């Protein structure tokens, strides 16, 4: 619910190759990096089952190559929240026939992008399951 501070897909070199601040109210590319730094540096590819930072939900994940960040508020249950996060790995994996890689990332961004807008759009998750998508999309 207009609830994504950003969803970022971050490299684990603290880099971010995706960020959409769906919702935002703080700025700076730097501050974004800084903010990123404290937490990323700290989580350092390691993640947690759950993590709350800022009273805010941090659901983040890692892949086998990439670090997934979503920032949200601990003010909206894990199970769902994760479900979207889950949705993110999985569909990308199946559809593409391949999940995220650094390589994958490097060849083309777009698909992520395409997906992303569809799934979520700002601080409101319009959707969180693949299938609909799968049919819906045909690129």
């Amino acid at each position: 619910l207009y609830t994504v501070k950003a969803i970022l897909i971050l490299d684990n070199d603290g880099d971010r190759l995706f960020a959409k601040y769906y919702d935002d109210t703080y700025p700076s590319v730097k501050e974004q990096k800084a903010f990123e730094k404290n937490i990323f540096n700290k989580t350092h590819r390691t993640d947690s089952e759950i993590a709350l930072l800022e009273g805010l939900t941090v659901v983040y994940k890692s892949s086998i190559d990439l670090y997934f960040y979503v920032i949200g508020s601990s003010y909206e249950n894990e199970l769902m929240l994760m479900a979207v996060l889950n949705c993110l790995f999985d569909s990308l994996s199946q559809m593409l026939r391949k999940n995220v890689e650094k390589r994958a990332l490097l060849e083309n961004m777009e698909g992520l992008f395409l997906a992303v807008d569809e799934i979520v759009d700002g601080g409101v998750i319009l959707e969180s399951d693949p299938q609909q998508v799968v049919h819906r999309v045909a690129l």
Binding site: Y2, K42, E49, I50, N77, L79, E110, G122, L126, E127
Partner: protein, 798 residues
């Protein structure tokens, strides 16, 4: 990498017709990438880009249709024109590539404007409403950003508008409701009848449920009415399904028991607790911290041990580590187990999911439950704290020290003893600064001089001009106060301990020199650093000068009356004031609606039981949420039978003027309507001071002598005072007496011989002999030193 430049040049690619969707798309992609990564640039170029891009648009090249959406999408609350597409939007609108249509509208809406708003509208209406769920969704999202801006344009449509929200897809159903988050922001009543709709049907989206919960909950705090059945109803509903989140959600708030609900709910909860109890919902941790609150009830507590023991045991899962601290805390602990744990902790804390942070939080809680208190623990802890350490204690210390002060701890001798020592050989200059400052104030109120000195010397012992310096500064509050031996010696010491090292020399010299400069006693001082309540109201009232008599206020209102009921636009609370001569009703308020400001305001009162009516006063202007004063004035007749208790009839008159709150307008025109004004009744307690007599014996009789009226009733269906009692103590506001007041939850006989003095000076006196034979027959006397009161009391008491 990113950079704008290639691309602007590269815009000439637009010039080709032989292109591949891929080829261009990529180029398009490149620009978008710089940006996805981040870019910043000029409008001119953007505008240009548009044109350039825009330029291309023969095709339906589908792919082409998307990219632009993006592109455009990039611009929304910080845009550049709107018009250009327009055609293109319409083109979709008649044009069945369904798909496409939806993305485009959506961007526009942060970017929007009102004229242009006009545009979509008949259709739009349709459109939101239209067909396949998919399309409809697309429609929705679009508003919201426009809602930022506004959305009321929409809003209006509403009686009619909502009904379409009626759904047949889950996902959708969930969605409908948030828009209703703002809808319910707008309205509460609506919900209520509404709920019975929400309540009415079982729901689809777990998701839909959730918003309701918050809400539902939100409602509950003060009570969501007789949640009994609803709460219950709900209770199942939250309770089970195939979607976990609800059960949990419900669970955390709902406890209820300090000697309260625990019934089913504890079992269900237990099913859950246990069920969760290994990261099903790693959620479980948070809850214990507050969401599902714990501070227990006594047998209840004992039961809790096992669950906490699992976490305590497991030591893993970030979600686990946190959980360990809250559960243990909330439920509390025995000393003994702590011991086992201290060792566990010894390893654990450093990183064990990065335990230190949870722990600092835990620790902050520790400092609080014992902030220098269970000092033995504080010391055990202290030893341990320092010990287990790392370094990370310091941070904690900032809290801990603070805690100790909060108590203003008293096993300081010991507490301090540990602190002092350890800190010495637990280092960090920084801590010292803080503590110094505090200590600085405290000194000889807590004695133990030799020790304290003993310490102090040590603190200084350390090098640092700076470290040294603090002992002297702390000392000033101390010195000045002196202790169990200090003044003589205090004088001796500064002498005994002295230093060179220039600026360090200087510090000694200077303090001295400073010392040198004031009489040390003085030195220390500088450096170290009726005509009631209601009468006041008679005066407060006095600043006005339109009077037509007043007097001095005698007593004031026994109860202020809201003259407009609850949360009304013209919300009124009124207070009534009595003087020996006049009574003023001064009217307190919040011309409520931001709709209105009321102007040309005066207050009518029309009376039944006497007062001479001098004037109705109103406030000149009353804007929203802001007391202003209006008054109504009377002079009080005192020696008449029936002449100061009155009910007065109220009608509010005003010329009603509309507001723009943004920036208003205040103009001569606007038209009146008048609204009913609530009654004012005047009491026998706005006027009276309740008393004890100057001469009861005599007075008691005497008051009879001159004054006395009577009423008798014989009570045959009820043999209880109590009804009578409710009207009399309370109406008159006087004292029941002659040690003839008291009755337990029963009593055989009762007299109130009762007192206070009425306005206009003279007194109003009452004797109520209530007599129980076993019927009650009773003699009520009112006797008075004022004529108007005897008739009055008999009435008034009712």
């Amino acid at each position: 990498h990113l950079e704008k430049s290639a691309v602007l040049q590269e815009a000439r690619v637009f010039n080709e017709t032989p292109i591949n969707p891929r080829k261009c798309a990529h180029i398009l992609t490149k620009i978008l990438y710089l940006i996805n990564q981040g870019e910043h640039l000029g409008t001119t170029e953007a505008t240009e880009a548009f044109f350039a891009m825009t330029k291309l648009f023969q095709s339906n090249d589908p792919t082409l249709r998307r990219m632009c959406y993006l592109t455009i999408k990039e611009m929304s609350c910080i845009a550049e024109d709107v018009i250009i597409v327009t055609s293109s939007l319409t083109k979709d609108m008649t044009g069945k590539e369904d798909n496409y249509r939806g993305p485009a509208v959506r961007a526009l809406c942060q970017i929007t404007d009102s004229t242009m708003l006009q545009a979509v509208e008949r259709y739009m209406k349709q459109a939101i409403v239209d067909k396949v769920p998919s399309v409809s969704s697309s429609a929705l999202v679009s508003s919201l950003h426009l809602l930022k801006c506004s959305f009321d344009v929409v809003k209006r449509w509403v009686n009619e508008a909502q009904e379409a929200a009626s759904s047949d897809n889950i996902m959708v159903q969930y969605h409908a409701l948030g828009l209703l988050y703002h809808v319910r922001k707008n309205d509460r009543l609506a919900v209520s009848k509404m709920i019975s709709k929400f309540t009415r049907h079982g729901l689809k989206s777990p998701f839909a449920y959730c918003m309701m919960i918050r809400v539902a909950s939100k409602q509950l705090e003060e009570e969501d009415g007789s949640r009994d059945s609803p709460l219950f109803d709900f209770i199942e509903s939250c309770l089970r399904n195939k979607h976990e989140m609800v059960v949990y959600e419900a669970a955390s708030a709902i406890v209820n028991l300090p000697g309260c609900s625990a019934k089913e709910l504890a079992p269900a909860v237990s099913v859950l607790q246990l069920f969760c109890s290994s990261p099903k919902a790693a959620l479980r941790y948070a809850a214990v911290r507050t969401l599902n609150k714990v501070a227990m009830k006594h047998p209840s507590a004992v039961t809790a041990c096992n669950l906490d023991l699992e976490n305590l045991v497991t030591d893993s899962n970030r979600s686990i580590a946190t959980l360990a601290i809250t559960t243990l805390l909330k439920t509390g602990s025995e000393s003994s187990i702590d011991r086992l744990m201290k060792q566990i902790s010894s390893f654990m804390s450093e990183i064990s999911d990065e335990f230190k942070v949870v722990v600092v939080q835990a620790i902050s809680a520790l400092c609080q439950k014992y902030p220098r208190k269970h000092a033995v623990l504080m010391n055990f802890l202290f030893t341990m704290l320092r010990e287990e350490g790392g370094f990370e204690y310091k941070r904690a210390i900032v809290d801990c020290i603070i805690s100790i002060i909060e108590e203003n701890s008293e096993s300081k001798e010991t507490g301090l003893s540990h602190l002092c020592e350890f800190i010495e050989d637990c280092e960090f200059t920084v801590l010292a600064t803080r503590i110094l400052h505090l200590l600085g104030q405290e000194g000889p109120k807590t004695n133990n001089p030799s020790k304290y000195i003993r310490f102090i010397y040590n603190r200084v012992v350390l090098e640092h001009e700076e470290v040294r310096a603090g002992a002297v500064s702390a000392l000033a509050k101390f010195g000045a106060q002196n202790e169990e031996m200090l003044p003589s010696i205090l004088v001796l010491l500064k002498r005994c301990v002295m230093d060179d090292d220039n600026e360090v020399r200087d510090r000694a010299t200077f303090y001295l020199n400073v010392l040198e400069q004031k009489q040390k006693a003085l030195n220390a001082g500088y450096i170290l650093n009726a005509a009631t309540r209601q009468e006041i109201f008679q005066e407060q009232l006095a600043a006005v000068p339109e009077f037509q008599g007043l007097g001095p206020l005698f007593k004031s209102s026994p109860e202020p009356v809201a003259l407009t009921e609850s949360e009304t636009e013209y919300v009124i609370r009124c207070t009534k004031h009595t003087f020996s001569d006049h009574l003023v009703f001064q009217f307190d308020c919040t011309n409520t609606l931001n709709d209105q400001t009321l102007e040309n305001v005066t207050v009518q009162m029309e009376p039944t039981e006497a007062y001479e009516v001098l004037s109705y006063v109103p406030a000149r202007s009353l804007p929203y949420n802001q007391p202003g004063t209006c008054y109504t004035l009377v002079a009080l007749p005192t020696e008449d039978p029936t002449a100061v208790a009155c009910t007065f009839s109220c009608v509010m008159k005003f010329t009603v003027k509309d507001c723009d709150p943004n920036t208003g307008e205040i103009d001569e025109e606007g038209y009146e309507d008048e609204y009913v004004l609530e009654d004012l009744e005047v009491t026998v307690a706005d006027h009276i001071q309740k008393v004890m007599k100057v001469n009861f014996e005599a007075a008691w009789d005497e008051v009879g002598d001159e004054f006395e009226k009577e009423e008798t009733f014989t009570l045959s269906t009820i043999k209880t005072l109590e009804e009578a009692v409710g009207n009399i103590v309370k109406f008159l506001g006087m004292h029941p007496c002659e040690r003839s007041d008291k009755v337990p939850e029963n009593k055989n006989t009762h007299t109130l011989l009762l007192a206070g003095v009425f306005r206009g000076g003279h007194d109003i006196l009452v004797r109520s002999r209530l007599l129980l034979l076993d019927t009650v027959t009773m003699q009520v006397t009112a006797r008075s030193s004022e004529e108007l009161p005897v008739d009055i009391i008999l009435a008034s008491v009712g």
